[PDB]
Design a protein around this ligand. Structure first.
Ligand SMILES: *C(=N)[C@H](C[C@@H]1CCNC1=O)NC(=O)[C@H](CC(C)C)NC(=O)[C@@H](NS(C)(=O)=O)C(C)(C)C
Ligand SMILES: *C(=N)[C@H](C[C@@H]1CCNC1=O)NC(=O)[C@H](CC(C)C)NC(=O)[C@@H](NS(C)(=O)=O)C(C)(C)C
Lengths: 292, 300
């Protein structure tokens, strides 16, 4: 079949740690001799207050424990990198895999290991939207949970959670400490990029449907529209220019032949489904996930 | 947000093994001093040939390695239990969690730890359908992959994979060895009971939509239908009698209160959508899904 595929959480689980600082509790990930947590564990600060506030943060106040290994770590030095804290601990993490800090481009998927008190409780799937937000599931104390990818032996760390916004959107940084989009870790109103559909992913879900359900749907458009004509329509209808990624073409072209529905018919179907749509989880299927 | 929640696979990853027998390779799970794997690793036998074939299977031809722990295990004795083999080994698994073999009733969900060569490659979510099949994702060598859930510390194993039927449906046994539904581990055409929706889960899907995507979608029915009237319609439209489980009613009444939409309107929306849908995308899907259970949508 064709399912939403997630990456096994074993590697992440053994590196998760709790970070409690003067009654503020969140999660952190422990790689080599460094624990990465969100900087607001030391307090709710804004703008450029963070530098001075971190320098006065006492190291012995960082209560850091690793539940899977039953070890309590001790911080030797605190360094703010971007909007994250790099806590150097005396112990090297024996379970550290080959890892990489890789930034995501919007339209890409990743597995969230949502943790509490340093223990991964749930695992679910998200795609970074063109507004640079994920639509996730988080409660108090979940900051520090990471969104990751796996390729063989190597853990690809992509996301660390920081903020939940009023419309159940979620923002965070990469593991370098830089946020996705213009959002910051401050409890104030923050303007959001207007939503836009990652067209490549919408095309992937429609093909996934024609490959799993039995008969061609009656709402599948009968006439095809040119890619060029779709992109003129897309500019005025909150859809990203197609293709969003040139490398997705090989996948989409392969789906088009397995399903025997030209991509030009899929795009006209998207346009004709406009009355139905007039955010709603259509960009969760990436072309690579559907094709492989 | 309301999401499809999966159980962290780390416990299962530490117990997966590879089992290779004279050219046939699949996975197994290693709990205490026992390795459980599908029986067809020894051959593609039918009917009542299994008792004899297993009895004459050489314990030395069982190559059993646990990759994440670097161990290669050695098989002391083999014993068939249902359609599963129970391979006793010299070594105890120190990573063995507190576990329980629990059989699933239809309409309940589990996390599939999809494995190859003893390594979990993917992790996804399925629900046992009323045909006792799961709509999963498997290729060669995936047999022995398990379905599981977690209640805090205990590992609840429900499923082990055996078969793929051509409609991309999958079948297997519980960890006791007995299949779900009338399917068996043979490469023959096997009659499938016609598909029926798990109405509780379809109701949970539409409620998930009201609570995260759009509180008042244009396809939400305005009038309601009684549970009784729906069940009369359901008997002729491949929807199970509502409710399929009486215990879902506590969750369903809760979702109704927070969504302030009585489930009678949800049931009438199900009936209207079988003629009115026209490609509407509900909770991220273009058809009715049994993946959302009331408990998961309510608890989250
Ligand atoms: C971190 N553990 C936490 C998790 C939130 C809690 C609710 N859901 C989540 O994802 N994050 C916060 O509490 C942050 C803290 C700031 C200082 C970075 N605050 C919020 O997310 C805030 N949203 S906001 C920016 O004010 O709109 C809440 C607390 C009102 C959700
Ligand atoms: C076990 N590892 C394997 C997994 C299959 C391969 C394709 N996807 C899967 O899920 N199972 C099999 O190869 C079984 C073996 C028998 C003896 C149980 N065979 C099949 O599932 C068979 N389908 S069937 C019952 O003949 O329609 C395949 C191989 C043709 C799919």
């Amino acid at each position: 079949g064709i399912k939403i595929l997630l990456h096994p959480s074993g590697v992440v689980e053994r590196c998760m740690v709790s970070v409690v600082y003067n009654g503020s509790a969140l999660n952190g990930i422990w790689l080599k001799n460094v624990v990465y947590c969100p900087r607001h564990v030391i307090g709710k600060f804004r703008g450029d207050q963070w530098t001075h506030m971190v320098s006065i943060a006492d190291c012995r106040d960082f209560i850091v424990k690793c539940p899977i290994q039953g070890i309590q770590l001790n911080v030797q030095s605190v360094k703010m990198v971007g909007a994250l804290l790099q806590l150097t601990v005396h112990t090297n993490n024996t379970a550290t895999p080959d890892y990489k800090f890789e930034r995501l481009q919007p339209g890409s998927s990743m597995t969230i290991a949502c943790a509490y008190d340093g223990i991964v409780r749930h695992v679910y799937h998200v795609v970074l939207q063109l507004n640079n937000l994920i639509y996730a599931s988080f409660l108090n104390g979940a900051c520090g949970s990471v969104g990751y990818t796996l390729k063989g032996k190597t853990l690809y760390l992509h996301y660390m959670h920081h903020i939940e916004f009023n419309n159940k959107t979620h923002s965070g940084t990469d593991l370098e400490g830089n946020f996705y989009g213009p959002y910051v870790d401050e409890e104030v109103i923050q303007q959001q990029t207007a939503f836009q559909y990652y067209t490549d992913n919408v095309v992937a879900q429609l093909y996934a449907h024609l490959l799993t359900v039995d008969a061609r749907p009656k709402w599948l458009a009968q006439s095809q529209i040119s890619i060029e004509d779709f992109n003129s329509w897309a500019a005025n209808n909150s859809f990203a220019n197609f293709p969003c990624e040139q490398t997705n073409m090989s996948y989409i072209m392969g789906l088009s032949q397995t399903a025997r529905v030209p991509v030009e018919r899929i795009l006209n179907t998207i346009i004709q489904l406009t009355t139905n749509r007039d955010y709603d989880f259509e960009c969760d299927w990436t072309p690579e996930m559907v094709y492989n």
